[PDB]
Design a protein around this nucleic acid. Structure first.
Ligand SMILES: [Zn+2]
Lengths: 61, 98, 126, 24, 213
RNA sequence: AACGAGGAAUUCCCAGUAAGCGCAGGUCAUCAGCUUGCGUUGAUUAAGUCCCUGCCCUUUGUACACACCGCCCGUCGCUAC
RNA sequence: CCGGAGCGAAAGCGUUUGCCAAGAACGUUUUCAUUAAUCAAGAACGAAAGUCGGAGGUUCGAAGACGAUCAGAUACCGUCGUAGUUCCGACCGUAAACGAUGCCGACCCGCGAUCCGGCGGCGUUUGACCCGCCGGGCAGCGUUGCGGGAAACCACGAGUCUCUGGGCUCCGGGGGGAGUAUGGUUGCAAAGCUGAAACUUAAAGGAAUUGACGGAAGGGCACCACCAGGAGUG
């Protein structure tokens, strides 16, 4: 399946047991669809870019 | 001393009610003293409902729910964190928690 | 799409995934979590049920099964009615392994009035 | 447990009856 | 040693022609090995399928059991065996603060098909009702159960198995009971939940081809 | 000579900080593998969480109050009535 | 479905239909016309376990075996299982049989619900729902800071109690000894009812409060916690 790219649009909050994960919603750039939320690890701010390998799941917490 | 006016049960005008069994311990608990908990949850989790949705051979199929009627004894409804020990004046609040 | 019926006996201490034909007469493939773990303590773990439904999809595809009707089942009867931890891991592994799912429905043996459940009137005092 | 003080008392009274019965 | 699936051949299961589709799926059985013919197992199987899998524009919580009775040319023919609602929809109709009046009859059709139809109805709260509980009195419970048992037999006694099935796929029996009970107490979810077939008569293939024709 | 980035575990730390390097003071007739200071070179990672282990507050329970290192029960054993 | 809803003197009582004879409340310009209330002696009933005699023994499960844990478990946990649990008759008359609160009667607050019956009112709906009211029934909330109480709490009064008297029955007199001994009595038995004394003791106990503690809950905090790693120890 073709790979899709997306830009970080908004940071929600810290998730995980140790609080290392950061729930951040993303939005595709090429095709306007699937403005789904994902879980990111590390320092994340508004304006980052996440190379989503898939576009199927949300994976909340 | 009498801790509750209703003695922790809903027996008013009766002498004996039918005892039922608990869920996580299987203890004989009276029907009026049981800690009712009507659990209604989806069959598939919200984290996995999307994988089942795309694998559905239909266009729009609402996933049914798990309608489970649970009964808890006092010793287990507190250990399972279903009910808590409230303050002396807070125990009189019969309103269900939001 | 070759529709089938998948019986998931999701209980405690073990998790069963039983795939049969549309009538449930002939068993096409069925495995347990103990067939994938060394210690039986990890049977009710969702990771064991994750590996169970994974290889099932291959046996379903080898024989031609493409779609599976989910029949979730707990212990039922006098014991608990909520399915075990393998109810969701086995269900998600079925769709993610390149299969089809349709008309999900749970069949738990709930009694109109059962006999005396195991454990006295004081309950299991673990 | 006051119930087992009643359990041991009924057990002691029952023994006193057997001792008193053999003296008939 | 040898894979037992090598001797298994697929059979396309069928259904009566009164529905919208006859193709219900595929089954499997081993071929004839010795005296045990493959037909000796495909004449007693039961397929529990929902109404949405049988009809095209109906509900999905009404399941129909279809027992196999004949195999003609690598395909397995089926017929009515019993109706039953889903476990989830049954637990959702039962609600609190309202009376539940159940009923059950065991009456046969014009033929020897002994059917046991189960109907369940709940009362309805009025729109301008301020009272939380909608409780009908015990004698008011009897009158509702009387009409519930009377219509189940009357509608199934004046027709054979073929016609009552077409009257069973929709809630035709359930909608008239609510209208009948409204004269005493309004009901909400009058539904025929389960149909059990206890005894089966001497089946004739002539009446089977008349339905599937 | 052992020691080939080191068993199960475990200590410390987020900015001139950790560490590396060396100096000086205290001890001191003789002495620093220590410690208190000092400057020097200078990052990795994190601008977080109750996850874990330690911690106070509130509610709650108590037959505890020289206060859970609390209090207290029975059998057995000794003596007296 | 099933509720702080009903019924019964209580124990107790919820699948359908049928049979059987009761009962409160309400309705009443019916009827009877003080025929009452409470009650030593006496009696019916009385959960469960147990006991005797049959049936049936699914499940559970005293006892019991075995598996685990522990310093040790004769237990909790697990497998299995006797009696028992189920039904039939005769016993036993004991429960935290509790509302830990006798019955009858009067008087003494309010409000919103709820249960049955009766009554009168816009409407909606072919009795249902709506707004009230009178009578009892289970209860609830508010005020008890019109009272009561040691207080918790009490209008199913636990109010009208030194401003002490409506009627009646039962019953308590510091804590133990002790519901023991003995006698009578009931029972097949286990035991039930009745019921002491010697002796010992300065407290036992009730309610409430502040501390402490919990292997209770909730919230919050620190690289002497972790996450991310970086040094070094072992
Ligand atoms: Zn319980």
């Amino acid at each position: 399946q073709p790979i899709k790219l997306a830009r970080v649009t908004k940071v929600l909050g810290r998730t995980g047991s140790q609080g290392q994960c950061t729930q951040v919603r993303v939005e595709f750039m090429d095709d306007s669809n699937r403005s789904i939320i994902r879980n990111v690890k590390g320092p994340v701010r508004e304006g980052d870019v996440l190379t989503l390998l898939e576009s199927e799941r949300e994976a909340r917490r | 001393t009498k801790k509750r006016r209703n003695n922790g049960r809903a027996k008013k005008g009766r002498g004996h009610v039918q005892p039922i069994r608990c869920t996580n311990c299987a203890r004989c608990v009276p029907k009026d003293k049981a800690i009712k908990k009507f659990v209604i949850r989806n069959i598939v989790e919200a984290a996995a409902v999307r994988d089942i949705s795309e694998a559905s051979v239909f266009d729009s199929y609402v996933l049914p729910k798990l309608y489970v009627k649970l009964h808890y004894c006092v010793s287990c409804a507190i250990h399972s964190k279903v009910v808590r020990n409230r303050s002396r004046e807070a125990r009189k609040d019969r309103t269900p928690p939001p | 799409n070759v529709f089938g019926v998948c019986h998931i006996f999701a209980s405690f201490n073990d998790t069963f995934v039983h795939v049969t034909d549309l009538s449930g007469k002939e068993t096409i493939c069925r495995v347990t979590g103990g067939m994938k773990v060394k210690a039986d303590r990890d049977e009710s773990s969702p990771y064991a049920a994750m590996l169970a439904a994974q290889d099932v999809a291959q046996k379903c595809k080898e024989l031609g099964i493409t779609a599976l009707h989910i029949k979730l089942r707990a212990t039922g009867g006098n014991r608990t009615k909520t399915p075990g931890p393998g109810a969701q891991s086995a269900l998600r592994a079925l769709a993610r392994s390149g299969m089809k799912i349709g008309r999900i429905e749970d069949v738990t043996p709930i009694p109109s009035d059962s006999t005396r459940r195991k454990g006295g009137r004081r309950g299991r005092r673990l | 447990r006051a119930k087992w003080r009643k359990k041991r008392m009924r057990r002691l009274k029952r023994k006193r009856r057997k001792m008193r019965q053999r003296s008939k | 040693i040898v894979d037992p699936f090598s001797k298994k051949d697929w059979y396309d299961v069928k259904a009566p022609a009164m529905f919208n589709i006859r193709n219900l799926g595929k089954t499997l059985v081993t071929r004839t090995q010795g005296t045990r013919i493959a037909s000796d197992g495909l004449k007693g199987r039961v397929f529990e399928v929902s109404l949405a899998d049988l009809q095209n524009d109906e509900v999905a919580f009404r399941k129909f059991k279809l027992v196999t009775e004949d195999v003609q040319g690598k395909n397995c023919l089926t017929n009515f065996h019993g109706m039953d609602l889903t476990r989830d929809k049954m637990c959702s109709m039962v609600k609190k603060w309202q009376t539940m009046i159940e009923a059950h009859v065991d009456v046969k059709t014009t033929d020897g098909y002994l059917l046991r139809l189960f109907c369940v109805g709940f009362t309805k709260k009025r729109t301008n009702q301020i009272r939380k509980t909608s409780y009908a009195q015990h004698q008011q419970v009897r009158q509702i159960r009387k009409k519930m048992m009377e219509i189940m037999t009357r509608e199934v006694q004046t027709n054979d198995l073929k016609e009552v099935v077409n009257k069973l796929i929709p809630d035709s029996v359930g909608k008239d009971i609510e209208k009948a009970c409204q004269s005493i107490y309004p009901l909400h979810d009058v539904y025929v939940r389960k149909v059990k077939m206890l005894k089966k008569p001497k089946f004739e293939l002539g009446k089977l081809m008349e339905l599937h024709g």
